[PDB]
Design a protein around this nucleic acid. Structure first.
Lengths: 82, 49, 184, 196, 166, 78, 70, 118
RNA sequence: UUGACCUCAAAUCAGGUAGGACUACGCGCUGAAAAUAAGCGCAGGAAAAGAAAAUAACCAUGAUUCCCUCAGUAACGUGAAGCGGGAAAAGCUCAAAUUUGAAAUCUGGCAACAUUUCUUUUGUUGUCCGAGUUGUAAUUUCAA
RNA sequence: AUUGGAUAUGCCAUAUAAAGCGCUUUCGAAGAGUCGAGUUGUGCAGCUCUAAAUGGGUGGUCAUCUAA
């Protein structure tokens, strides 16, 4: 749950709506390093925070939210509503 | 004088308390130092500092 | 030895605190961080001291003359101080370590802080005396400090300290923080 | 436990914020008249009268009598049974209290009175229920605290011109004309079973 | 901001924390003088919201009055007479015990350049604001003398409007 | 015509922070003398005696009612 | 008089009409470096830039500085 | 029948107020002496068939009429943050009150601030 | 052994301010045989009130004050208020949200430079000390 | 002889800024020994007790206002 992005990042490198935008923004720009860049980029952070809002809303009490935020690249789960 | 009872803080709250986004103030170089800098340059040009 | 009315007031007040049955929220502010970790905490803090009003000008003149003749940086790293500013940081979970002055005069100010920092999971300690915390920030007094983010060079030192505050402050006491102080 | 020495009849009294002095005296006089009634402080709400049922359960009261003062001049008296039961709302005007020297009747406090009901009460189906409820509430329960076994007062209920003329006897002083308006199947609300 | 926590903590005036502090503080003040200056507000949020700023010109005084008019109203007039060069802004309740009620009284200096130049308290420098507490113009003064918008709250009666062409 | 909400009528709804700040103070401050007495009576299940005590203290039934569920939830959380 | 007030009014609006403002030397370089590298019409791309767009100017102001250059 | 109010100053109060009108507009010539008030319905059953001058135009009246709150008080159009349009009748009666006003208005240009550089 | 502060002092310390008078009208408080007189405190050229914890029950009104009307009505001999007509009209400011990529703020000393009802008045600029993070500025005031 | 406010014109100007209004895939902090309940003195005040958050106040379930 906290390594979903890492598997995709590794697999894509080996074989080289808002959530889709968030993936492209990080891929163009590119775990602590991933969390560092997002927390240090204003435009990227807005996309990442939006991505967690869509994925959590699209998917409720079963998923580990804290691990879900780590998948996107944030230190802690943001104060998203639902 | 009963022992302290923590009926709320026994758990750790993962989300931040506030929901508002981060204004771009905290990512761009300070605007307030810019007023100070441009006022500082002006005195230098006009011969005050 | 006829004491002045204010010497009598100072000492009777001190005796009164140790005699009464102090509530647990005020009782925790009497069992504080040890001395060895206290100097170690401030060894790190004195790297991230905010620049003085003397330095903040001498720096800004250098940019002004650079602009005035002919002419961008990195985020300034320092320590976060101020009650409202720090209390916000814990709630926003931007604080890595909170150091609470042990002797704030109206104790209403910090009495809720250990509960709040425990609630958000921010490692905290109650450092002895405010005037120590005051000198870190170039002030007479600081009710509370907080480390929010340090450079990668000192990221290992902060992690080492945080585990010490866990083991020396929160691992110890903990249960004693839930007993009514005083009554001695 | 649930109840020690449970009396047959228990009553509760509530007052309105905006009751005049004359309205205040009437509640005070009737409260002293009925030994099986417990007086309680004001209820804040004006249309949320459902709270009375929980209060009566709290005080183990079988009958609730809410004195409602409308526009600070009138008085609307509502009487209902504790568990469910029918709620009768009526406007009580033409009221005379013990502060009137025109009646000089004297009786011991807490004495159980004798109720005389007019035959017009049983003539109508709606009035029959009102007469029985009033008789049950007015009747001092046996073994009631501070009650007097001796009887020295007589209460007469008559249905004349659609207004109940409250008469207590030598008159005591309490003389009111109550105009029954609506009877609700529930307690202080619910379906309406009668209209004026 | 801590002033949110402090205000919601000043509501519980009999909890374990408040009870200890009340008895501890009410003892301190009773040793000190009846009207003694405070180096800071003992309620840094209530004073904050009534018009106190931590800046030169703003003065806090603490006063106790026996129990048994309005105590807050006497707290104004007794301190307003004590510091006779200072304007009385507001005041608030800090503590009470079986005999006294303690208040703190916010005062400002009309003569101070940090006050005379800030356009949010310039008004109290004006002459019309001399001894507001002595004329029922503080909040406890306006509340006490019925000043209030609503239905809840002389010469117009006993005169003759004897017009010209009547 | 339907009218957009006047922001004064929003007053008193709640906040995510103001609720949170009120929860912390409830734990930190402790409980008043009467709240200690009321709480003990709930644990002993003398609720009818407990609720009638609250109304005597506060003054109105809704105020007395509201405080009871504040303490009972505190009991369950504890 | 009303006719006189009218022609006087529209006269002053004409004399004080050039509300357009130039770009200071800093801005002249500031927008040029952004346009020399992100084409000219991709105002969303320049906003997302973190190095050249240090001030974090929004897209609406980037166009404002663009049209101000001409 | 104690202290009396006698109106011998009625004719001199008539002129004192006339001179105040004369003094005022002479200070602000081109602009009218008074602001425009809306037309509102009295709040009763004895008076709801009549039209009378209000206190100012509500937020929505100016928004539809084409002036914002800040520029509406400069040109002399009082705003009324209390009053609100409960029916489309009052909206249209007062929207076209400002329409004729903004047509008869000649806002004189002010002095601009033009820095030497951008 | 040396220092931070906290609280408390003292000074013919540097600079300031308060008192007393007048009292027709103002605002309180106290109060008789009328909420009067007398008493007491406090202001200004006006004071007070004042931008709704307001009315109403409408097709709704829209800070305050004042005049006419309401009306000798209502309520309980006392004695309203809303609506209605007029006079005048002007609105606004804080506390409570992190400036946190920078206490951005202010008193004072000195040094200059101007200005002036004015050599008497009023400031700006630099500079040093302090105030202040237990919160001084910018921002926001529910109409949002 | 002092001055009020505009007008014309000159010289400086920190505009690396500040402000209004469309739009929102975001949020919206709001004043406590005070409201209030019991009693007492003549709406306010004293004592005893002591709140809440679509909450609270005031009107006739709706309306209206948003105190300290």
């Amino acid at each position: 749950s906290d390594k979903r992005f890492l598997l995709l990042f590794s697999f894509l490198k080996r074989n080289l709506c808002a959530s889709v935008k968030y993936m492209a923004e990080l891929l163009n720009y590119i775990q602590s390093q991933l969390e560092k860049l997002v927390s240090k980029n204003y435009y990227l952070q807005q996309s990442a925070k939006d991505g967690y809002r869509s994925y959590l809303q699209a998917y409720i009490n079963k998923l580990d939210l804290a691990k879900v935020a780590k998948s996107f690249g944030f230190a802690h789960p943001p104060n998203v509503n639902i | 004088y009963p022992d302290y009872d923590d009926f709320f803080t026994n758990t750790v709250r993962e989300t931040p308390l506030s929901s508002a986004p981060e204004p771009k103030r905290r990512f761009a170089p300070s605007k307030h130092e810019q007023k100070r800098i441009l006022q500082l340059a002006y005195a230098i040009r006009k011969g005050r500092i | 030895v006829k004491w002045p009315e204010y010497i009598r007031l100072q000492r009777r007040r001190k005796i009164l605190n140790l005699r009464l049955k102090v509530p647990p929220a005020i009782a925790q502010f009497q069992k504080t961080l040890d001395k060895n970790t206290a100097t170690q905490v401030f060894k790190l803090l004195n790297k991230y001291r905010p620049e003085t009003a003397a330095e903040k000008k001498q720096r800004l003149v250098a940019e002004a003359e650079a602009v005035a003749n002919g002419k961008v940086s990195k985020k300034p790293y320092n320590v976060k101080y101020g009650l409202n500013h720090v209390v916000a940081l814990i709630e926003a979970k931007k604080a890595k370590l909170v150091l609470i002055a042990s002797d704030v005069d109206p104790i209403e100010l910090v009495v809720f802080l250990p509960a709040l920092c425990k609630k958000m999971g921010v490692p905290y300690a109650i450092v002895k005396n405010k005037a120590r915390l005051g000198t870190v920030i170039h002030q007479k007094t600081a009710a509370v400090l907080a480390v929010t983010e340090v450079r990668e060079e000192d990221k290992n030192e902060l992690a080492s300290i945080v585990s010490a505050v866990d083991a020396n402050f929160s691992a110890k006491y903990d249960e004693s923080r839930r007993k009514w102080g005083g009554g001695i | 436990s649930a109840g020690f020495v449970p009396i047959k009849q228990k009553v509760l009294v509530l007052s309105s914020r905006g009751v005049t002095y004359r309205q205040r005296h009437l509640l005070n006089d009737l409260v002293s008249m009925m030994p099986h009634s417990k007086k309680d402080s004001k209820l804040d709400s004006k249309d949320r009268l459902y709270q009375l049922n929980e209060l009566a359960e709290l005080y183990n009261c079988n009958n609730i009598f809410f004195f409602e003062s409308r526009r600070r001049e009138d008085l609307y008296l509502h009487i209902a049974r504790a568990p469910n039961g029918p709620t009768v709302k009526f406007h009580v005007e033409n009221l005379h209290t013990m502060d009137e020297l025109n009646m000089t009747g004297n009786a011991l406090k807490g004495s159980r009175p004798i109720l005389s009901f007019d035959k017009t009460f049983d003539t109508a189906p709606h009035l029959k229920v009102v007469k029985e409820l009033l008789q049950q509430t007015f009747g001092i329960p046996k073994g009631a605290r501070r009650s007097k076994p001796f009887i020295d007062r007589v209460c007469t209920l008559t249905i004349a011109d659609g207004k109940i003329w409250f008469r207590n006897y030598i008159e005591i002083g309490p003389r009111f004309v109550m105009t029954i308006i609506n009877i609700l199947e529930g307690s202080f609300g619910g379906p309406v079973i009668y209209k004026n | 901001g801590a002033y949110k926590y402090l205000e919601e903590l000043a509501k519980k005036k009999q909890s374990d924390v408040n009870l200890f502090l009340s008895r501890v503080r009410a003892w301190e003040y009773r040793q000190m003088n009846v009207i003694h200056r405070a180096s800071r507000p003992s309620r840094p949020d209530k004073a904050r919201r009534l018009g106190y700023k931590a800046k030169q010109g703003y003065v806090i005084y603490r006063i106790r009055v026996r129990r048994g008019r309005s105590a807050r109203c006497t707290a104004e007039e007794r301190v307003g007479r004590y510091c006779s060069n200072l304007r009385v802004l507001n005041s608030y309740w800090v503590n009470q015990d079986a005999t006294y009620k303690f208040f703190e009284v916010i005062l400002v200096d009309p003569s101070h350049k940090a006050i005379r130049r800030d356009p949010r308290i310039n008004w109290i420098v004006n002459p019309v604001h001399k001894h507001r507490e002595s004329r029922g113009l503080t909040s406890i003064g306006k509340k006490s003398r019925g000043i209030g918008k609503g239905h809840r709250f002389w010469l117009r009666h006993n005169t003759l409007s004897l017009r010209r062409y009547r | 015509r339907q009218l957009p909400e006047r922001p004064s009528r929003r007053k008193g709804h709640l906040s995510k922070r103001t609720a949170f700040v009120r929860s912390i103070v409830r734990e930190v401050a402790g409980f008043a003398p009467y709240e200690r007495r009321v709480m003990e009576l709930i644990r002993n299940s003398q609720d009818k005696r407990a609720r009638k005590l609250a109304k005597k203290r506060l003054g109105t039934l809704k105020r007395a009612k509201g405080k009871i569920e504040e303490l009972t939830s505190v009991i369950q959380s504890s | 008089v009303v006719r006189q007030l009218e022609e006087e009014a529209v006269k002053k609006a004409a004399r004080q009409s050039n509300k357009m403002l130039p770009l200071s030397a800093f801005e002249h370089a500031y927008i040029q470096r952004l346009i020399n590298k992100y084409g000219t019409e991709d105002f969303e791309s320049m906003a997302k830039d973190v190095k050249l767009n240090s001030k974090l100017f929004n897209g609406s102001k980037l166009k404002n500085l663009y049209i101000r250059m001409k | 029948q104690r202290y009396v109010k006698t109106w011998f100053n009625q004719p001199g109060r008539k002129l004192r107020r006339r001179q105040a009108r004369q003094t005022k507009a002479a200070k602000i010539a081109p602009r009218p002496v008074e602001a425009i008030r809306p037309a509102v319905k009295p709040p009763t059953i004895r008076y709801n068939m009549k039209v009378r001058a209000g206190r100012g135009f509500t937020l929505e009246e100016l928004k539809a009429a084409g002036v914002s709150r800040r520029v509406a008080s400069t040109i002399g159009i009082p705003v009324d943050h209390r009053r609100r349009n409960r029916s489309e009748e009052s909206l249209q009666r007062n929207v076209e009150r400002i329409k004729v006003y903004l047509a008869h208005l000649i806002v004189f240009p002010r002095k601009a601030g033009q820095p030497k550089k951008g």
